[PDB]
Design an enzyme around this catalytic site. Structure first.
Site, PDB file in Angstrom:
ATOM      1  N   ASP A  11       0.748  -1.348   0.085  1.00 12.41           N
ATOM      2  CA  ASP A  11       0.110  -0.025  -0.078  1.00 12.41           C
ATOM      3  C   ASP A  11       0.985   1.094  -0.030  1.00 12.41           C
ATOM      4  O   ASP A  11       1.497   1.481   0.738  1.00 12.41           O
ATOM      5  CB  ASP A  11      -0.800   0.190   1.047  1.00 12.41           C
ATOM      6  CG  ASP A  11      -1.583   1.193   1.342  1.00 12.41           C
ATOM      7  OD1 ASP A  11      -1.463   2.418   0.644  1.00 12.41           O
ATOM      8  OD2 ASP A  11      -2.431   1.495   2.630  1.00 12.41           O
ATOM      9  N   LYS A  73       2.313  11.708  -3.375  1.00 12.57           N
ATOM     10  CA  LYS A  73       1.408  11.175  -4.006  1.00 12.57           C
ATOM     11  C   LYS A  73       0.345  12.164  -4.671  1.00 12.57           C
ATOM     12  O   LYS A  73      -0.149  11.942  -5.856  1.00 12.57           O
ATOM     13  CB  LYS A  73       0.482  10.159  -3.077  1.00 12.57           C
ATOM     14  CG  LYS A  73      -0.356   8.833  -4.059  1.00 12.57           C
ATOM     15  CD  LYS A  73      -0.980   8.211  -2.850  1.00 12.57           C
ATOM     16  CE  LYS A  73      -1.947   7.270  -3.557  1.00 12.57           C
ATOM     17  NZ  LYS A  73      -2.590   6.196  -2.384  1.00 12.57           N
ATOM     18  N   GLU A 178      -7.307   0.182  -4.923  1.00 13.81           N
ATOM     19  CA  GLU A 178      -7.349  -0.022  -3.271  1.00 13.81           C
ATOM     20  C   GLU A 178      -8.946  -0.584  -2.797  1.00 13.81           C
ATOM     21  O   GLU A 178      -8.518  -1.353  -1.875  1.00 13.81           O
ATOM     22  CB  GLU A 178      -7.165   1.495  -2.850  1.00 13.81           C
ATOM     23  CG  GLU A 178      -5.617   2.037  -2.991  1.00 13.81           C
ATOM     24  CD  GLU A 178      -5.664   3.608  -2.273  1.00 13.81           C
ATOM     25  OE1 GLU A 178      -6.095   3.835  -1.215  1.00 13.81           O
ATOM     26  OE2 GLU A 178      -5.022   4.527  -3.163  1.00 13.81           O
ATOM     27  N   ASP A 201     -13.335   3.712   0.575  1.00 15.65           N
ATOM     28  CA  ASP A 201     -11.992   4.003   0.940  1.00 15.65           C
ATOM     29  C   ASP A 201     -11.567   5.588   0.956  1.00 15.65           C
ATOM     30  O   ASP A 201     -11.289   6.351  -0.085  1.00 15.65           O
ATOM     31  CB  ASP A 201     -10.994   3.447  -0.353  1.00 15.65           C
ATOM     32  CG  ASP A 201      -9.369   3.766   0.379  1.00 15.65           C
ATOM     33  OD1 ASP A 201      -9.166   3.536   1.487  1.00 15.65           O
ATOM     34  OD2 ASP A 201      -8.779   4.072  -0.537  1.00 15.65           O
TER      35      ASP A 201
END
Ligand SMILES: Nc1ncnc2c1ncn2[C@@H]1O[C@H](COP(=O)(O)OP(=O)(O)OP(=O)(O)O)[C@@H](O)[C@H]1O
Ligand SMILES: [Mg+2]
Ligand SMILES: [Zn+2]
Ligand SMILES: [Zn+2]
Length: 606
Positions: A11, A73, A178, A201
């Site tokens: 992850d 990110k 994810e 998520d």
């Protein structure tokens, strides 16, 4: 085929990253050198030349904000003119500069030296740390990885995450979305028939929602949507903007210019936020906040909510679209699964319960770890000889692909929520050199969508009676990434294919430099480690001899006053030497060890 070794599941999150591994019919989530099953996605460059990663980088954020990198990110896979990038950099302490119309991170590596980094290389460093954390647990070396990305990441974002993997010396086998990964973690062992599962998520920087079908061990994603720039860091940023304003009201000082202050505030805000998930109130006390003076305030949960309510509610908009695309309605949903740390916020849980008319979401499932859990499972499968349960994954592309046509019309090609791998052929009759602009997004006009890339066809053969017929093929692979090929239907044997790919991507030359620069830094970090560990050998050897001499029972009863004085002196000389040459180089220590051994050796061998 390749011996892929052990494959790890990563992850690669905005604020945190997590590595797992499938072995002995079980997932193990792997702890790092500090005993933490998650690792801050931070890298920092200390003034002393040192390059820290994870917890250690994060712990020095407020003393060195300008050269601590984080939330990379939010920049990976984007262009300079992206509105999201331009808004973000306004709250980042480290410099961010344009080049090749992409945002590059610029910092001080120490000794007056400036380095600029692509977000891919910063993510590479985070992944390298995750690689090492695993290699330690296994006691062996690792070369293949499964890496997560948010379902709603586009083509560039996927490719860049893959490149990041490469630069950290990893073969990214599968990019996995994810919510899909979390779904596996939820419903791998379930044997209850076909149930509709909604995976929600919400993490540190991104928001993904997927509706899956989970029939026994078969996972199928029906529809996906989200917001790639919405998460915990945005709630934090609203609470910061507020306390800065408040502090200017109450003291007249504007602290926005001092990165230390802001960053101290960020740190404690975050800590407050977390507390407010189980308390109704949190004191935010920062000592020597600004100029020299202390800061002190109280954030009630009610206030944390007023500040963030628009953002909380906007998570329902993608959840609607998901159902709309699923042709299903709220009562059809059998379970709603929550993952991401940000789902611990009571108001998010509440807005979700209310949207599904009082339906209670699912517990049992660690929201920080689930995504890596599932990635590890998918890694086990790819590692060959593992006994995972049955697993079948059918996952989808998230954004419609199309091409620009006369006017600026988004002539649709591959609809969103199409299962991948998929492909679409397209005959064109334009000869010469044709330019194809591909686009991503659901709007019927090109201007209002995202440009994925520009593909020039230069190969076409020239006709005697006119016009060539070319078949352009748009394939989307299992990772979600587009490949574009061509062939003409005028020649038997020869097929003439030339794709120049005018598109904002790291070249294979650029990736080679960044891979070799990473290998250099490793070697550099290795030698800083040998310099430490051999200074310690010297310092221990010296102390050890000093004990043995002052010890009348063992090695000091054997010595004469002549040899005793010469030992005392040789050791005492090298210790107060070591105390004043801490900055000495590896060869200095190697020499002094050998100067001391020269002298001691004849003496102790009597
Ligand atoms: N009890 C809590 N209350 C509120 N927020 C929390 C709590 N615990 C963790 N968080 C938040 O969760 C966020 C991180 O969650 P998570 O690690 O799932 O995301 P990530 O993997 O870093 O990034 P991505 O968003 O890209 O998946 C942080 O912003 C943190 O503030
Ligand atoms: Mg020297
Ligand atoms: Zn995560
Ligand atoms: Zn069935």
């Amino acid at each position: 085929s390749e011996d892929v070794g052990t494959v790890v599941g990563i992850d690669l999150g905005t604020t945190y990253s997590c590595v797992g591994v499938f072995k002995n019919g079980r997932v193990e989530i792997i702890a790092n050198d500090q005993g933490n099953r998650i690792t801050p996605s931070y890298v920092a460059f200390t003034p002393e030349g040192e390059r820290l990663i994870g917890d250690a980088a994060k712990n020095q954020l407020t003393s060195n904000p300008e050269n601590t990198v984080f939330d990379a990110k939010r920049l990976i896979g984007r262009t300079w003119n992206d509105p999201s990038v331009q808004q973000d950099i306004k709250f980042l302490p480290f410099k961010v500069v344009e080049k090749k119309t992409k945002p590059y991170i610029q910092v001080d590596i120490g000794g007056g030296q400036t380095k600029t980094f692509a977000p891919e290389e910063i993510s590479a460093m985070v992944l390298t740390k995750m690689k090492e954390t695993a290699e330690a647990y296994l006691g062996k070396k690792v070369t293949h990885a499964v890496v997560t990305v948010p379902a709603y990441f586009n083509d560039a974002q996927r490719q860049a995450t893959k490149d990041a993997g490469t630069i950290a010396g990893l073969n990214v086998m599968r990019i996995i979305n994810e919510p899909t990964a979390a779904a596996i973690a939820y419903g791998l062992d379930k044997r209850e028939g076909e149930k509709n599962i909604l995976v929600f998520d919400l993490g540190g920087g991104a928001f993904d929602v997927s509706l899956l079908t989970i029939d026994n061990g078969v996972f199928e994603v029906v529809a996906t949507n989200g917001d790639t720039h919405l998460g915990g860091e945005d709630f934090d940023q609203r609470v910061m903007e507020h306390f800065i304003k408040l502090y200017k009201k109450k003291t007249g000082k504007d602290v926005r210019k001092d990165n230390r202050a802001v960053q101290k505030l960020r740190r404690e805000v975050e800590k407050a936020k977390r507390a407010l998930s189980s308390q109704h109130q949190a004191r935010i006390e920062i000592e020597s906040f600004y100029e020299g003076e202390d800061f002190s305030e109280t954030l009630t949960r009610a206030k944390f909510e007023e500040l963030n309510m628009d953002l909380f509610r906007s998570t329902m908009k993608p959840v609607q679209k998901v159902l709309e695309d699923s042709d299903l309605k709220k009562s059809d949903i059998d379970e709603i699964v929550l993952v991401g740390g940000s789902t611990r916020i009571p108001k998010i849980q509440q807005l979700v319960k209310e949207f599904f008319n009082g339906k209670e979401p699912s517990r049992g499932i660690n929201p920080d770890e689930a995504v890596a859990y599932g990635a590890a499972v998918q890694a086990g499968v790819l590692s060959g000889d593992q006994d995972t349960g049955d697993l079948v994954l059918l996952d989808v592309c998230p954004l419609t692909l199309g091409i620009e046509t006369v006017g600026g019309v988004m002539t649709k090609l591959i609809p969103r929520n199409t299962v991948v791998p998929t492909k679409k052929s397209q005959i064109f009759s334009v000869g010469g050199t044709v330019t194809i602009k591909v686009y991503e997004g659901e709007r019927p006009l090109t201007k209002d969508n995202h440009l994925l890339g520009t593909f020039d066809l230069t190969g076409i053969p020239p006709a005697p009676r006119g016009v060539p017929q070319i078949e352009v093929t748009f394939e989307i692979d299992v990772n979600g990434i587009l490949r574009v090929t061509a062939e003409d239907k005028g020649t038997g044997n020869k097929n003439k294919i030339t794709i120049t790919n005018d598109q904002n991507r790291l070249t294979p030359e650029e990736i080679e430099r960044m891979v070799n620069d990473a290998e250099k830094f490793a070697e550099e970090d290795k030698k800083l480690k040998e310099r430490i560990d051999t200074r310690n050998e010297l310092e221990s050897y010296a102390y050890s001899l000093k004990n043995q001499i002052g010890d009348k029972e063992k090695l000091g009863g054997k010595l004469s006053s002549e040899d005793k004085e010469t030992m005392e002196k040789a050791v005492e000389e090298k210790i107060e030497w070591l105390e004043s040459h801490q900055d000495a180089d590896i060869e200095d220590f190697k020499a002094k060890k050998k100067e001391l051994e020269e002298i001691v050796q004849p003496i102790i061998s009597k």
